[PDB]
């Protein structure tokens, strides 16, 4: 007798300043009889911070928050809706009901910005001077402000193509161009990165017309 | 209305955690307390709530046998404890104001990171990444557990800044890095120092990225 909440979709990509649409089921009705208010609540969380409330009582606005953010419904049935999604409106979005203990939350819904292709500016860094003491090198190469999301790495040394000794990681969706950005690391023994001269990032990505490469020579 | 929890920190498995969370202003008053998880990449789950006035807490009943709410109204301070940890219970843990009588959840702590592992805490080091744009950085190595946490020159820098997930290295030990793109004209001007924050060891560089 837990109240399910269940959202749908899991995840929606539009293009910018298009109406998102988030919907919320409840296993239970929220409507409590007596005030005919309904306990549901939706929340905004982005990466590395708190969830932040946006709607109470089912289609009141907390303080703050834009007028493109707006929810609906009664009983079980509910829906946010943002009517114009801005850069800035890339999160996950949980409804929640608190009509009774314990209380719930939806699955959350991923909302992304779906934009024109951003071919990547790539760099890439030497380890330093200071990591060399400790007998490892981490060679990174960075690409900047993609769209979308899909890249791929090749490291080379000395035109050798590297395998099992690398690691990447992206960011989330920019808040502001709606690009992601990618890190990639190679780590070599002090010994290894001694032996070889040519360090090389190659990039692939469909915002490029051929793979780009950049590289320095050791020294 | 501010909620300021204590920090992340590892816990063997078996052990037990004690998390709090600080309410400035001086009082919860006549609110209420949630403590809310957040396992990595997952949904939000409500633990238990504690309402000071009604000197009474409730818990999710998962959680029954391992939990424990308490709240010292003298010091505006609420405390979650969990017991015999596992591996499951690695999670960011907030802390989160409401009314008794509703149950919406208005304003929230900043989340603390507890990890379970048998790993022993160790401190980052922190390297540079030296550089009409330009690409400079600092690599923040070797570190357990997360999280760390990076500003720029002391939080003015913000704009073209990305810091990464980090990534578990094959030593067990995490690996991040940060970067920012600026002019490169400013690089004769400007000092570019990349602010490095590892609480679980007491752990703070602030690293001069020279050209």
């Known amino acids: 007798m837990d109240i399910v909440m269940t959202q749908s979709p899991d995840s929606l990509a539009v293009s910018l300043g298009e109406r998102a649409t988030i919907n919320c089921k409840s296993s239970?009705?929220?409507?409590?009889?007596?005030?005919?208010?309904?306990?549901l609540a939706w929340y905004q969380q982005k990466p590395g911070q708190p969830p932040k409330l946006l709607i109470y009582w089912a289609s009141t606005r907390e303080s703050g928050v834009p007028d493109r953010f707006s929810g609906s419904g009664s009983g079980t049935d509910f829906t946010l809706t943002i009517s114009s999604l801005q850069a800035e409106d890339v999160a996950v979005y949980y409804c929640q009901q608190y009509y009774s203990t314990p209380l719930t939350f939806g699955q959350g819904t991923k909302v992304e910005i779906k934009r024109t292709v951003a071919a990547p500016s790539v760099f890439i860094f030497p380890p330093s001077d200071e990591q060399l003491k400790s007998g490892t090198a981490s060679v990174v190469c960075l690409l900047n402000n993609f769209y979308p999301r899909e890249a791929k790495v090749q490291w080379k040394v000395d035109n050798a193509l590297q395998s099992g000794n690398s690691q990447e990681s992206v960011t989330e969706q920019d808040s502001k161009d709606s690009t992601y950005s990618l890190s990639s690391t190679l780590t070599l023994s002090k010994a290894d990165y001694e032996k070889h001269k040519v360090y090389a990032c190659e990039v692939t990505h469909q915002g490029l017309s051929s793979p780009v490469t950049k590289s320095f020579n050791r020294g | 209305v501010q909620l300021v929890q204590s920090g992340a920190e590892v816990k063997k498995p078996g052990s037990s955690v004690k998390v709090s969370c600080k309410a400035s202003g001086g009082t919860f008053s006549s609110y209420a307390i949630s403590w809310v998880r957040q396992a990595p990449g997952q949904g939000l789950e409500w633990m238990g709530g504690?309402?000071?006035?009604?000197?009474?807490?409730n818990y999710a009943q998962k959680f029954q046998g391992r939990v424990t709410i308490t709240a010292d109204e003298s010091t505006s301070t609420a405390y979650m404890e969990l017991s015999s940890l596992r591996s499951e219970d690695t999670a960011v843990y907030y802390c989160?104001?409401?009314?008794?009588?509703?149950?919406?959840?208005?304003?929230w702590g900043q989340g603390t990171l507890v990890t379970v592992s048998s790993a022993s805490t160790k401190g980052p080091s922190v390297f540079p990444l030296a550089p009409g744009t330009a690409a400079l950085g600092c690599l923040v190595k070797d570190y357990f557990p997360e999280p760390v946490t990076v500003s720029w020159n002391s939080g003015a820098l913000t704009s073209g800044v990305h810091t990464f997930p980090a990534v578990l290295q094959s030593s067990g030990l995490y690996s991040l890095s940060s970067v920012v793109t600026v002019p490169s004209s400013s690089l004769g001007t400007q000092t570019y120092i990349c602010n490095v924050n590892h609480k679980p060891s007491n752990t703070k560089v602030d690293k001069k990225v020279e050209p």
């Open positions: 504690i309402i000071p006035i009604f000197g009474t807490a």
């Open positions: 239970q009705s929220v409507l409590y009889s007596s005030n005919n208010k309904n306990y």
């Open positions: 989160a104001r409401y009314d008794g009588i509703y149950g919406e959840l208005d304003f």
